[PDB]
């Protein structure tokens, strides 16, 4: 008897041969046949039921047999059947029939006799300490990995995902995240599966996090926030003293690092909204991340900082002790040579200081403002960066730094409300660095460089804001500012403001960017005003604004914002006081301006008729 004939006897006889020892022999036989022949002699049109026959035997073999048998026996039988099953999930010749594999997972009884429950039972954690069964477990993890990484058809993916969502399986997987389990026990496939069932299932995320408890309570110890945190930390504890130079020859260290990285990735997926990230922060997540990223490994650091970025807008960060975390993170941003880390860190900094005075104070005492100056200064002009991905990154980085700056400068600008804070000499020297000529040149060149970068619009809007706030800051010397001329365009700040303003009108019309374009326009008008007043340069601003067409035409739409209208009226009037002939050259909607003379607001009305008297009688 050859293998082909022996395998076919085995297949034909399986269901009427209940004897355990013969069943084992038959399984080896079928496996051997498959390993060797690879279905090549089987007619293509018969393949569907050839596969079904085998699948039906795999399933039957995994069922308990009433005769009591040693674990050694079952591990050997199942190892053979699971190895066949594994092969079905990667073998090219079987790939068109893979939906039959997936269909096996579909529940028929909704109980322990179902294929999915037998399978999921084989990856039970307590099997991992059994000498024979651990090998069956490892094989089932490979089967999950192969199907999840393998199947391309999206409807099939969706089906398989649904089959996996049952309490027994999520329970089983979660037991690997229990505090008492050594993290070396954690098969990476456990992450693949969690990622897979969680994907696009908002409520599954909430089931894992909250376990049906109130979103304002401390996240439950039965849920993933507490569990994933203890796994992060448990792994950190074991790698902490380990020299990273051993990595290439230290598989245990490699495995734990990878466990930490996939835990960061999984938490990233779980924390979908505000309630989740606030839960994470109340469970000391931010402290946990910052502790773990002390380990010198860049993938690990990149992944930790990515998650920090994601949770940075949490209101709970107003209650977290930041006296140690924040200086550590500033130090990291200062020395870490890779832009992704700088991007994440500065992004985090901008959100964490927002609306939180005591946090601003911590940052200032650790020289946060000085550091912003250093980060912006280290990069070339945006026009000197060739690769689009990297140019956009630098752009988002500078944008982060200036947004952080702007959250600081609020403190010190006179608010009628009565909270006029006084800057100390420490704050003063840090802030005043931002009017040094080198950074002014770089900032004005971002404003006017001529490239296709998605972040550019938001950057130019943020820069205008920075200048607005700097120039309204009492201790900032303003006398040198309009004397700074760039090497490239031979223009001063006014010329650069005017270039950004022109640029924005040539940009594509797109409801995504409309809001930001409007804010850039407003900030332009508002910055020209500030420059006029604060640098005593009313003449200079007006005559250096010949590049700008009649600002009054900005009001031709349904512009309802009262401060914008007033600004537009006032700037126009001040331009015509010094460049009288522009009144005859501009083309205005005169009846609209007359309308504004009788406006509810008295400031607007006063500006309107003052501006009206400038024009010909026509």
């Amino acid at each position: 008897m050859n293998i082909t004939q022996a395998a076919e006897q085995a297949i034909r006889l399986w269901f009427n041969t209940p004897d355990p020892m013969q069943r084992l022999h038959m399984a080896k036989t079928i496996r051997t046949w498959i390993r060797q022949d690879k279905f090549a002699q089987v007619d293509q049109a018969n393949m569907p039921n050839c596969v079904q026959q085998i699948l039906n035997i795999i399933y039957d073999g995994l069922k308990p047999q009433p005769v009591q048998l040693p674990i050694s026996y079952y591990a050997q039988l199942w190892y053979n059947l699971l190895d066949i099953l594994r092969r079905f999930t990667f073998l090219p010749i079987i790939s068109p029939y893979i939906h039959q594999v997936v269909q096996m997972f579909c529940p028929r009884e909704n109980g322990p006799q179902d294929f999915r429950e037998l399978i999921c039972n084989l990856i039970s954690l307590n099997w991992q300490k059994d000498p024979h069964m651990k090998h069956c477990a490892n094989q089932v993890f490979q089967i999950f990995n192969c199907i999840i990484m393998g199947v391309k058809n999206e409807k099939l993916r969706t089906e398989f995902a649904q089959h996996l969502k049952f309490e027994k399986l999520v329970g089983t997987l979660s037991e690997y995240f229990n505090p008492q389990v050594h993290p070396g026990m954690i098969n990476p496939a456990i992450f693949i599966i969690f990622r897979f069932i969680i994907s696009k299932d908002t409520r599954l995320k909430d089931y894992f996090i909250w376990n049906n408890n109130p979103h304002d309570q401390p996240p439950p110890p039965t849920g993933l926030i507490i569990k994933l945190n203890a796994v992060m930390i448990g792994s950190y504890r074991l790698i902490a003293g380990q020299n990273p130079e051993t990595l290439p020859q230290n598989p245990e260290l490699a495995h734990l690092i990878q466990v930490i990285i996939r835990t960061f990735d999984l938490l990233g997926l779980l924390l979908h909204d505000s309630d989740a990230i606030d839960g994470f922060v109340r469970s000391d997540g931010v402290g946990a991340i910052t502790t773990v990223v002390q380990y010198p490994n860049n993938d690990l650091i990149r992944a930790g900082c990515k998650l920090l970025l994601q949770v940075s807008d949490a209101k709970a960060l107003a209650k977290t002790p930041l006296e140690n975390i924040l200086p550590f993170l500033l130090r990291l941003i200062e020395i870490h040579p890779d832009d992704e880390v700088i991007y994440s860190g500065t992004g985090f900094l901008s959100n964490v200081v927002a609306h939180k005075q005591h946090v601003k104070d911590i940052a200032i005492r650790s020289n946060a403002i000085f550091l912003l100056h250093t980060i912006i200064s280290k990069y070339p002009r945006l026009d000197e960066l060739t690769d689009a991905p990297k140019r956009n990154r630098v752009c988002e980085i500078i944008c982060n730094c200036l947004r952080t700056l702007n959250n600081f400068l609020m403190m010190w600008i006179p608010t009628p409300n009565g909270e006029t804070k006084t800057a100390g000499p420490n704050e003063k020297q840090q802030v005043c660095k931002f009017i040094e000529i080198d950074i002014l040149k770089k900032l004005m060149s971002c404003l006017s460089c001529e490239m296709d970068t998605p972040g550019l619009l938001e950057l130019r809007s943020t820069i205008l804001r920075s200048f607005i706030l700097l120039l309204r800051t009492p201790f900032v010397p303003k006398d040198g500012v309009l004397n700074v001329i760039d090497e490239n365009r031979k223009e001063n700040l006014i010329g650069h403001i005017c270039a950004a303003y022109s640029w924005v009108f040539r940009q594509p019309n797109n409801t995504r960017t409309q809001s930001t374009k409007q804010q850039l326009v407003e900030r332009t008008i508002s910055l020209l005003l500030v420059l006029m007043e604060q640098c005593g340069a009313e003449k200079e601003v007006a005559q250096y604004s010949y590049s700008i067409d009649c600002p009054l035409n900005l009001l031709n739409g349904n512009q309802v914002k009262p401060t914008f209208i007033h600004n537009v009226l006032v700037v126009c009037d001040k331009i015509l006081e010094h460049c009288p002939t522009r009144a005859d050259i501009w083309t205005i909607d005169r009846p609209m301006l007359e309308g504004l003379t009788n406006h509810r607001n008295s400031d607007i009305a006063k500006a309107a008729n003052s501006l009206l008297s400038r024009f010909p009688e026509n």
């Binding site: 979908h272 807008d313 609306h355 982060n400 959250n407």
Partner: peptide, 8 residues
């Protein structure tokens, strides 16, 4: 008001 950016 201070400015907050959502990175999600």
């Amino acid at each position: 008001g201070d400015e907050v950016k959502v990175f999600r």
